[PDB]
RNA sequence: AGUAGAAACAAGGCC
RNA sequence: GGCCUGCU
């Protein structure tokens, strides 16, 4: 009735038809926007320079009716001139305070819901368990990590639909949320704001903060997960380690140490079946995590897996920006390349045919507990440079180099019974069978591969056959630093087909994943995986 | 013993203490009145680093032009604006070669965002020159005033609520005989109008202003600001180039600080360790002389038209507008220049314009020479600046140049033994080049300096240096076989942001955690950063602990305050608490950490949604402040706060009041007055900007019919109620076909 | 389907065919020509014809090859700063009353009352440009003024001056000239253009080292008092507390802290007057509030301010004031010091002497100065520096934690076996302790915001270049120029008559002849 | 006068 | 003498 009597007003005034009018809705934004005002260049200097003036501060003009002109002493709290652009009245900052001692009183049991994240992290900490300081070189590595650690893995624009469906149901447009996980949410967080008075606009921001992702690079040591980030700047120096344990875990990292289980586990069987890719589906639609399916995570959660990958691509999702090999996630970063589709002997005198690759290209390695940058020519390595954690990591990540560079100094450095076909004259991939060979120990391809000389800039840590580093003659083209980049989370989202048998390629023809790539571990997931089709123990 | 801390460097490297050399803890060199000289000065070089090149008069302006692409070659190591054409395809086209499919995807995603874009994110922008007004205002005052002026001449498709049709009514305004602007004067206003000739030198000109707040420099530099018709064509090709420059490991403009660490350290580390022992490798830290002079808008124009090869010709023809403006672009001289009579004791402003016609008795020797150089240039008080860019504007499409001379340098394109790499921002580069001697270096470094020359890219030798690979220096980022913090460049961050109490407490604690993430600030460091900001905090808002006797204007009601509270442990610094902050503690508000110690009464009173000083105007702006980096661009600072009642907007000028635009501040009202009854009836006007093509009123009465309705049927209204509303409706709706 | 259709046509397809390369008349055939263009080798063609001429040759850098910077020849360099740095004296009560806790002109009625042995004053040192009479009576006012306070029941918070002829000049009042239009004053003799020329040369004196020197110096008081923070509850928290404990020892006895808290208080009080009122005049005692070591909080008054009006509109406007300051320095054994201030003597001072009392004069330096809104923003945050300076000390602390994985935060602070050179005597190079090197970066970083200027900030940069030239010849890695002698004339350029800027400019030449050896 | 340094303040407009 | 403004 207020309102209507408002408009009332403003349609009898002249200039308010005007504007009404000629204005249109699209430009409402814009007029909301028309403001006189300059923006601060030096914000610090005009908020210094403007506490020292008798009303500096702003406010409604209701606090003409709800905080007296002057307090006890005498001080005056508000004045009757307006704001320059507004009907707001120019009022001391005095006015807050004594709102803060004599105003009125409200119950703010509502906050608590409001600003959830902000009381977690406060719960989070107040239970943490702080260990020793540990002083040692700090090897920090630039990487893209989550900060939010309560976000519900939602894009804005993704979830910016659910704050809608939940606050103002009836502005969602032609938006349906078809995925379960988003109706799930709906609901429970319709549920805690029923009456909430604080505002819809914070809380809907809230709700965003809430439920939107948000990754930052970030240099980080020791752990990766969310809740293990948000005190990188308590657990982690350039000299100090801080032993931490976080007092509470996270739904986003169940969800997706979960599904990564969940895929990998689906893929080891589909692997084995005679139609891998229909059993793939099948199992994927029999199956959810937590009560929800695992279909809506997989549109819905953006995740970094060579079994995730394949399950996505399978049900005709998008997927990372270039291919894996050997469990490591490689990215070209120069050069061109063409396959040739010719053939070769072993050392066991085995023929075989492979494609190699013509041009010199530069690639980023990468992998779970190492590192790795790779620098090779057509059919020619180049040079090999490591940055990982313990040894073995890095014995790991130079014998994948070496099989990836198709050198016949590799080639040449087979020995013993490696069969490159299966049990019923099936025809395997060679590289994977040679880094499986290679896999028991590459004594010989150690003691084959060549030796070198180096400028020993940089004080660059020497090779290991059998731990045993050289500070000033090495093997040809492998290096070891101390600290590395990571690269790779800046993603060019690439088109890919898929075979039946679960061979990935780009839309050139290359191959970018395989079931081979995939961990041989066995975990035990977080969150209860549910199977449901006809026998619930065959995942 | 005088005692000398530049010593220290004898045994501590330099890049180990740089923070030592950089004098950031006092006031920046400011500009203090015109900068028309800086104008004159910048327009006169660039036309003087052009020289040799071709004069031209321009049919639609009048304005006199000299190209100098395709020009003869320089013959000496001065600054040269002579780029050649062909060689500037050739590079695009090696540059393809070498990242095969980037044009094309790079015009798709750019062709998508044309077919999604909307007029409205042009608000979101810096000052913009207006052209109805002649006078710099914010972005979204320009655009609605170009856009009243548009519809008060005739030119209307905007109402379908797209960028691209608004430079499709631009570009139709170009080809109007007489545009009709208004002007105020004192309170009323006047009806003007502008031939062809007059509309086409408003719309192609730039406004100059001088810049402040810039370290490392002892003169003064000139920047620009464009109209709303160019803003549009930049944008798109900003957003081009910045979907290029993505996806070139090479490039490193459309990322941050830590991104460009990464690919630094990645070349550096590819140039000395994956390069073989027996090749020697040397990094120049290099820099670019004059760099916004030399770049030519028609190399631009060339390399647009080579990206979007085999595009369809609707997107060539809007990536191609902004580098046919940019050529034919005018700079406005600037505020004038002030006279003093010692003799007679008197004071006078002269406008900019006047130049043109002023006697030449009052200047001195050096202005007097600007202003003869510059006077032919000068039609109706503008200066054509087409032989050069003036700031900045097309910074990405420079970083692609840099990195197309940088990926000739790959060992398939040279022949050669020597190579090179590396990595180049605007205006600064690193490069690394590899080769098996000294005589391979100097050839490399002779040929990227020959190669940079041919495509109007001059290398500063007065800011780069050749030493080997190991130490180098980009963009204020000292790289000494590893990279070293600095803490200098962020320290004018570590103050009172001045945005509200909320806001200033949380971005200091932001600040100082990520200051202790990315630049490797310790844990001692941090917890005094925490203290002086604190007492900093204090002293300003004039909010101390309560338990103390400093006596200000707004010591009392801090004191009764004080008294009040049972539990003193649950007040905020801003009501006059104890500081209850740490390490532990830097990543949780204000408002968070005192919850459990607060009174309930205390509680209540801040956190309450009725108080009459908070107000939220966009999600936009509810939680991030424009922050300007010190030798660094204006950025965005994020920072977490909690809505209390300190979170208050600032007071304005109020200086408006004494001017002729003296009548914007009702419309204000009236604007801030209309949208806030728009969000009363659609309550998501806030949150998302409302879409569609229909008058504000038209949409109003519909909701009042539908919210009539509903309540009628299950709701408060009663039938009366009912239909007295429905008879305002045909009311109103005869009332606006009327 | 509907098809898009964005046409160029009209005055933007002009304007598009003047546009192009001078070989062309029109788009159509520029993209013509390009959409045909192959790569056919055309860069290695023109860069044949480029002359040779055109080069990027490469001159080494030695030992030999540096130079010395050249400094400015002139007049001496006079000082810039708003207060007196090591020529200050103070006045006190022994209040225990903390750095705020007071109104500041009741405390500086004690500080005054506390002394007795005042004369008629008279100058010492004239302006020799100036009328110092008008200095010696605004003196007398003052003191008038003080004494009506003492009378009054009710000590003012904020005192107002009468706007005499003497405060009138001394602040600038209806100095400016009046704003006409250019169409009624044209044929003026004299008008001109605002002067607009280098500024005058000045040449490095021997007074900014010995105020460096005095300012990385010890002293009997505690200047910083920090705020509270919260309870340590992780052992990393009590690491970073000890090694703040050992920095805040170190640095809380220095006079660099000192000028820090005198800049932040005063620029505080300048700014907050020059808000309030504007139209007055405004007297502002200078007080700083330490602790001596016993524990006693003392109150201290260094002198006291006179802000002019105040109509401040730009950043860089100039708000003007009048400071006077108690010393005991003679104006007449560094005269070119001091050519901007007038000095009077106002009394006798009888310290604590074993040769019976000496009974040293006591002058006061009064001047006119002016300041900006900025210029004050940034001097009410000099507490930077102390950031700065610590951030690096620790910075330093933590590169050695990493190599001895232990804490080295005890062995430096105490056992001072490592020493970093901080200071050449005639000998040679002496070396110092890490408490050294802090106090003497905290008094860079005092100097650099009491002396900021772009004359520093252009220097700081030019010279970063030639120190890393100079750290990359010293760590053999062949390092090399392209135009050294022009880089020189660039960092040359930006010596003009900044004593900081001129200082700092020697303190590099020192660097480069002790190092390249 | 002073601040400051490639052009400004050292108050501006309105009655 | 009275009001207005202090980045317009």
Known sequence: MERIKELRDLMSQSRTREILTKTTVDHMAIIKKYTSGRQEKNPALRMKWMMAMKYPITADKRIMEMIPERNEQGQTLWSKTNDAGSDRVMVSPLAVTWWNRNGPTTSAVHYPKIYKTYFEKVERL??????????????????????????????????????????????????????????????????????????????????????????????????????????????????????????????????????????????????????????????????????????????????????????????????????????????????????????????????????????????????????????????????????????????????????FSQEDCMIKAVRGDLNFVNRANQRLNPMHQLLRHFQKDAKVLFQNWGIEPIDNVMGMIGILPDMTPSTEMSMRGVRVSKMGVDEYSSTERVVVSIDRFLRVRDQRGNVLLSPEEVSETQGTEKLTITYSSSMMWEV | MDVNPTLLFLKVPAQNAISTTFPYTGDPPYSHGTGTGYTMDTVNRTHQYSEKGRWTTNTETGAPQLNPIDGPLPEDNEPSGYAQTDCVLEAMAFLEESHPGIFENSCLETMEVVQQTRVDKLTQGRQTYDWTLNRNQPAATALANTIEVFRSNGLTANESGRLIDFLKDVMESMDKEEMEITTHFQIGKKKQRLNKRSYLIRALTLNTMTKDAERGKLKRRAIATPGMQIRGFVYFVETLARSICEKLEQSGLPVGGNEKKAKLANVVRKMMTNSQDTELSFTITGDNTKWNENQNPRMFLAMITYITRNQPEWFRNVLSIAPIMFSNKMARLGKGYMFESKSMKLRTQIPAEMLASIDLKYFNDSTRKKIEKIRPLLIDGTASLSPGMMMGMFNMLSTVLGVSILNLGQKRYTKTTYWWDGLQSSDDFALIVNAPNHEGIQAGVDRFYRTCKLLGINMSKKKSYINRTGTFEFTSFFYRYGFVANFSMELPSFGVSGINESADMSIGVTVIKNNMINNDLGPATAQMALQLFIKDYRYTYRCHRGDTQIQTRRSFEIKKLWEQTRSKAGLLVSDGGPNLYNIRNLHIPEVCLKWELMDEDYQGRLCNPLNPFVSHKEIESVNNAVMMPAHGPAKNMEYDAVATTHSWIPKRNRSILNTSQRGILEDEQMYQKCCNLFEKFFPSSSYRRPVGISSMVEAMVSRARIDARIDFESGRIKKEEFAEIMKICSTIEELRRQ | TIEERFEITGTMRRLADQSLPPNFSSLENFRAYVDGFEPNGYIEGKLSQMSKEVNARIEPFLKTTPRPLRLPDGPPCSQRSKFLLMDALKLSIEDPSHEGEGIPLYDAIKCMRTFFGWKEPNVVKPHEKGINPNYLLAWKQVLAELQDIENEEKIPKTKNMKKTSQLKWALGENMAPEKVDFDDCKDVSDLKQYDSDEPELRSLASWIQSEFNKACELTDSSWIELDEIGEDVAPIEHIASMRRNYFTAEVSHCRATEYIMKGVYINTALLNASCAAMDDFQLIPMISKCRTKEGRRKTNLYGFIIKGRSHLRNDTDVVNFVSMEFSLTDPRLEPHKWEKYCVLEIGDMLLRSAIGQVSRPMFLYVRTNGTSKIKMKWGMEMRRCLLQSLQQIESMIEAESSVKEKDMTKEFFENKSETWPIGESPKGVEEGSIGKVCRTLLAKSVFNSLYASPQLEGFSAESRKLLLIVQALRDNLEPGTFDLGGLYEAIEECLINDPWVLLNASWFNSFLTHALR
């Open chain 1, 126 to 403: 107040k239970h943490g368990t702080f260990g020793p300081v540990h002083f040692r070189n700090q090897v920090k590595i630039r990487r893209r990590v989550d900060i939010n650690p309560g976000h519900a893995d939602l894009s804005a624009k993704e979830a910016q639909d659910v704050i809608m469906e939940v606050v103002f149901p009836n502005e969602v447009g032609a938006r349906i949320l078809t995925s379960e996980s988003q109706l799930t949410i709906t609901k429970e967080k319709k549920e805690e704001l029923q009456d909430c008075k604080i505002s819809p606009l914070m809380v809907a921001y809230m709700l965003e903060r809430e439920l939107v992702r948000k990754t930052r690079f970030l240099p980080v040591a020791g752990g990766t997960s969310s809740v293990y980030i948000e005190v990188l700047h308590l657990t982690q120096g350039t000299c100090w380690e801080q032993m931490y344990t976080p007092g509470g875990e996270v739904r986003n990292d169940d969800v997706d140490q979960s599904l990564i289980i969940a895929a990998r586990n689906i893929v080891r069987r589909a692997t084995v079946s005679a139609d891998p890719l229909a059993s793939l589906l099948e199992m994927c639609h029999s199956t959810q995590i937590g009560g929800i399916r695992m279909v809506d995570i997989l549109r819905q959660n953006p995740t970094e897996e060579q079994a995730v990958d394949i399950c996505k691509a399978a049900m005709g999702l998008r997927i990372s920006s270039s291919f894996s090999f050997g469990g490591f996630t490689f990215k070209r970063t120069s050069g061109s390349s063409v396959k040739r589709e010719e053939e070769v002997l072993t050392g066991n005198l085995q023929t075989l045919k492979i494609r190699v690759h013509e041009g010199y290209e530069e690639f980023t390695m990468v992998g779970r507990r190492a590192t790795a940058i790779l620098r090779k020519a057509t059919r020619r390595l180049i040079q090999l440079i490591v940055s990982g954690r313990d040894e073995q990591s890095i014995a790991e990540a130079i014998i994948v180099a070496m099989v």
